[PDB]
Every structure is written in structure tokens, then in C-alpha cells.
Design a protein around this nucleic acid. Structure first.
Ligand code: MN
Length: 395
DNA sequence: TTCGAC
DNA sequence: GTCGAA
């Protein structure tokens, strides 16, 4: 595996230094198209040296690493570190014409982050930072990582997985639900390309456990309608679902409704009437240690598999993969199992939250990031959640 | 809320 | 919590 970046260039995975060097040389896979060529930096430390250094590093690295040229950074200063004062400056910024907001908070402050973050996600791409955490020693690493996620939030594509276009799924739908407490949950469905790029994402409102199966179906239907409306010629002959999340235990009823949903989409010509599909459950399992391997595919039964990833003692991060439903022929079966497992391994190398791979499939990881926000926006009574469907606002 | 491992 | 990363 390699990552594809700008200008047809590919760099090795598992190597941050070469990835950044690569970006500087060849640019990211896609430079975001900006409307204003302007970003706001909002903070409360007008004379702070660390803020000056932060701003200077953001300017240089946006230009040199990201090949986003001639961008202007405008500063906005809030006086009091509370919601209404910070909001007024967010408003002055939005009124001036900016592509994104980089907002420095005084410290870790959970209710204030969720109230503001929730308000920004509904308005404009944004990247938060904590004033109290900045340091001279960490600032380069800090800014390089932050820009991965901020460029992505602006609609850029830092890098994609180089995969063989003849193998794997036409689309992968990561779906399931996440309980936010003992009673309430939200369903999610996110469509990905085999190269790890998110094409479209839908999340349900917060609902009770009793409404889970109905909203699971409607959420998946909505995400495909939206993918297909925006990608009318994107045929899907090979479809995989990756089901995850802490959700109600209702396996057979859930599998039944997911096959119905695939059948309905077939009827509506959203996917091929001869689509080959599998429904998979993906579950993180307990780590183990090899006492003194990687991307290894383990068969437990005809339908249960593990994929092991690197995590004296070698720590291993295991992922359980169960094929709960498929319409594969028994002759293609073995071939298809290799293909879905290799695809899960490729997707586990895609993470636009930072340079370092999470070694967890993006189809599982990005829904976890959404969960964190939807759950805490609810708990701290923030603002409930089209640029949203196609952009990774949750990074 | 840099992220993510210890 | 605390710290190290190309
Ligand atoms: Mn983030």
C-alpha cells in the first residue's frame, strides 16, 4: 500500500516524514477550491507570542505543504471568554467573507466547545484550538496535524489509498447506530469509495431504542438517494455494508431489515438489480501481544474472520469481521472474502484526522467521531446538527 | 478542543 | 493525566 497525493505521486504508508515531504513536493491529492481565499483566526490574546507563532506557521504550511496559495488570514479578538462574546466575533468573521474559521479557546471547556462547535458546524468549516495547550516545543507538530483535518474540512483531499480499481467494492456503506445513553441513540450511514474517500453521510435525529430499526432503514435509504442524486452514473455492482456501533442487540431483525433495504434500493434502481453484496459486522476485540503479525487474515468459521493489525512484545489490534449476509456464489466465495478483508485492511490506513493512521477502518472510525459530537451536543444542549453531507465536519 | 498512545 | 510526533 501507498498513498496517492498530488501530481500523480504516491508515497509509502506508515511514514509521516515522507508523507509531509511528499505534500510539499507534489501537493495534496486535491487542493480545496475556496471562494474568498480568506480564513479567520479568532482568539483572545492580541499580544501573545504563541498566537503570533501559530498564525505564522499556519500561513507558511497552508502555502507550502498544502499548496493553497495567497490565502489571507484575518484576526478577530473576543474580549470575554464566554459563549456570547466569542459568537459575536464568529459572526463578524462570517459577515466579512471567509472560507473557514480557526478558533482559539482559552482552555478545555466542554460545554463551551460543544455549544460553539455545534453552532459552527451548521455555518462554516471550522478548526478549534486551545490557547493553554500551545507551546513552542510542539507548535510545528501541532500545526501540521491540525491542517490535515482543517484542509479536509475545507473540502480538500489530503491523500487517497492507491488501490486496484478492479478489486473491492464500488461503494462501502458504513452504517449502524450509537447509543448515547441507556435509552437514546442516533443511526448513521456513510458512503465511501474504495480509496477511503467519504462521498456522502446521513445521520438520524436522536431517537429511542424502540425506533432503531425504522431509522436505520430510512438513514441508509437517505444516504444512497443523496449519493445517487449527486453521482447518477456511479454504478454499483458490488456493494458492502460495514455495520458497527454500540447499538440495540437485535441481530437477526437488524440483518433482515438491512437485506430489505438493499432489496428496496435495487427496486428503485439506486444500486444494480444484480448487485453482489455482503453485510458485515465489524467489532474491535480485545488487544493481544505476540511475545518475542500484520494485516493477517484469520478465518474462524465460514462466516467469522479476524483481521489483525499492528497496534519483546508486539501489540496487536484485532478486528472481528462477520459476514452476516451475502448473495455470493459458493464458487466466488473464497475470492470475495479475500477482497472484502483486503479492503478493510486498506480502509484501516485512511484517517484524515492527522498524519498518523488509526489502524481502524475509516467506515468504523468516522462514525465514532460523529457519535462523540451528537452525544455531547445533546448532553450540553448545543445546536442540533448540504456542505455537511459531503464534508468531514466531524474530524 | 491537534491526536492518540501509555 | 501526561507526553511525543515527522
Ligand atoms: Mn478535530
Amino acid at each position: 500500500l501507498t498513498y496517492r497525493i498530488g501530481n500523480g505521486a504516491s508515497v509509502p504508508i506508515s511514514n509521516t516524514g515522507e508523507l509531509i515531504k511528499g505534500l510539499r513536493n507534489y501537493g495534496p491529492y486535491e487542493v480545496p477550491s475556496l471562494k474568498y481565499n480568506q480564513i479567520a483566526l479568532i482568539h483572545n490574546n492580541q499580544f501573545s507570542s504563541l498566537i503570533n507563532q501559530l498564525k505564522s506557521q499556519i500561513s507558511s504550511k497552508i502555502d507550502e505543504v498544502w499548496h493553497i496559495h495567497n490565502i489571507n488570514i484575518s484576526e478577530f479578538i473576543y474580549d470575554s471568554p464566554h459563549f456570547d462574546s466569542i459568537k459575536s466575533q464568529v459572526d463578524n468573521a462570517i459577515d466579512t467573507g471567509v472560507d473557514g474559521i480557526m478558533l482559539v479557546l482559552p482552555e478545555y471547556n466542554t460545554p463551551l466547545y460543544y455549544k460553539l462547535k455545534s453552532y459552527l458546524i451548521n455555518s462554516i468549516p471550522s478548526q478549534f484550538m486551545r490557547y493553554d495547550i500551545l507551546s513552542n516545543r510542539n507548535l510545528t507538530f501541532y500545526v501540521d496535524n491540525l491542517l490535515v483535518q482543517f484542509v479536509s474540512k475545507l473540502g480538500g483531499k489530503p491523500w487517497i489509498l492507491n488501490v486496484d480499481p478492479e478489486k473491492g467494492s464500488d461503494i462501502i456503506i458504513g452504517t449502524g447506530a450509537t447509543r448515547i445513553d441507556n435509552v437514546n441513540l442516533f443511526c448513521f450511514a456513510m458512503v465511501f469509495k474504495k480509496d477511503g474517500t467519504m462521498l456522502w453521510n446521513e445521520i438520524s435525529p436522536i431517537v429511542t431504542s424502540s425506533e432503531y430499526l425504522t431509522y436505520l432503514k430510512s438513514t441508509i435509504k437517505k444516504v444512497v438517494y443523496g449519493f445517487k442524486k449527486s453521482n447518477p452514473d456511479w454504478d454499483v455492482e458490488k456493494l458492502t455494508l460495514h455495520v458497527s456501533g454500540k447499538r440495540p442487540k437485535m441481530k437477526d431483525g437488524e440483518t433482515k431489515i438491512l437485506k430489505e433495504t438493499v432489496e428496496e434500493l435495487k427496486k428503485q434502481e439506486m444500486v444494480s438489480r444484480d448487485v453482489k453484496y455482503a453485510i458485515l459486522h465489524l467489532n474491535e476485540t480485545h488487544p493481544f501481544w505476540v511475545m518475542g503479525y500484520e494485516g493477517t487474515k484469520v478465518k474462524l468459521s465460514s462466516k467469522r474472520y479476524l483481521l489483525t493489525l499492528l497496534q519483546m512484545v508486539t501489540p496487536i489490534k484485532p478486528l472481528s469481521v462477520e459476514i452476516v449476509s451475502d448473495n455470493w456464489t459458493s464458487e466466488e466465495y473464497y475470492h470475495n472474502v479475500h477482497e472484502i478483508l483486503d479492503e478493510i485492511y486498506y480502509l484501516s490506513k485512511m484517517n484524515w484526522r492527522g498524519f498518523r493512521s488509526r489502524n481502524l477502518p475509516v467506515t468504523v472510525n468516522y462514525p465514532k467521531l460523529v457519535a462523540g459530537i451528537i452525544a455531547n451536543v445533546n448532553r450540553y444542549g448545543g445546536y442540533p446538527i448540504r456542505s455537511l453531507q459531503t464534508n468531514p465536519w466531524f474530524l
